[PDB]
Write a new protein. Sequence first.
Length: 217
Amino acid sequence: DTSGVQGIDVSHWQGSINWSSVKSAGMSFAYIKATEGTNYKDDRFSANYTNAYNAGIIRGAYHFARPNASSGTAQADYFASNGGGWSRDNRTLPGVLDIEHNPSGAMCYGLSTTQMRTWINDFHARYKARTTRDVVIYTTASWWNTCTGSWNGMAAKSPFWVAHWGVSAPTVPSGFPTWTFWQYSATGRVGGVSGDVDRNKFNGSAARLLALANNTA
Ligand SMILES: [Cl-]
Ligand SMILES: [Cl-]
Ligand SMILES: [Cl-]
Ligand SMILES: [Cl-]
Ligand SMILES: [Cl-]
Ligand SMILES: [Cl-]
Ligand SMILES: [Cl-]
Ligand SMILES: [Cl-]
């Protein structure tokens, strides 16, 4: 759904990005990969974070979780110290916890549903202690339901960024009251980015997006 407030998310896979072109293409926001696990740092993060801001894009950072590698508390601190920090400046979104299918091992990272709930709660608690913000959770409905056992525990704690490509509207797990961001394509096109780009829609007005960035709503 390309209507209303639109954005993209990128990582080093997108290479060199011309953010002024992303902005002139009509994008309002972007999430940029910063860290993964305990010691991976996206090589394009600093430049993207700087250039997106200078181009006037409301932007934030995301952490790709590896729950098997360390506690939720540990990865939240790592993220907050390496790109996930937040402060009010009209252009910084609250950080994102990208927790999804394990790319190298059991899909739920060897954690029981109860341990996974604890891990996510710990990441949220530490990220909030570090930044004052409620971390945004990026995941798929399948992963959420399977690995957390259809948990409703984050409904009042974390905005939901749902990944559901190729559908007219996203399916939302019962554990979230609604979706805040929705990644509807991983094969889009946007000026300034060469090749496939992830496209996102924000569930609300331009003012609501700014309020989310500034922590006023
Ligand atoms: Cl289009
Ligand atoms: Cl364009
Ligand atoms: Cl860590
Ligand atoms: Cl694992
Ligand atoms: Cl918040
Ligand atoms: Cl529940
Ligand atoms: Cl909807
Ligand atoms: Cl497109």
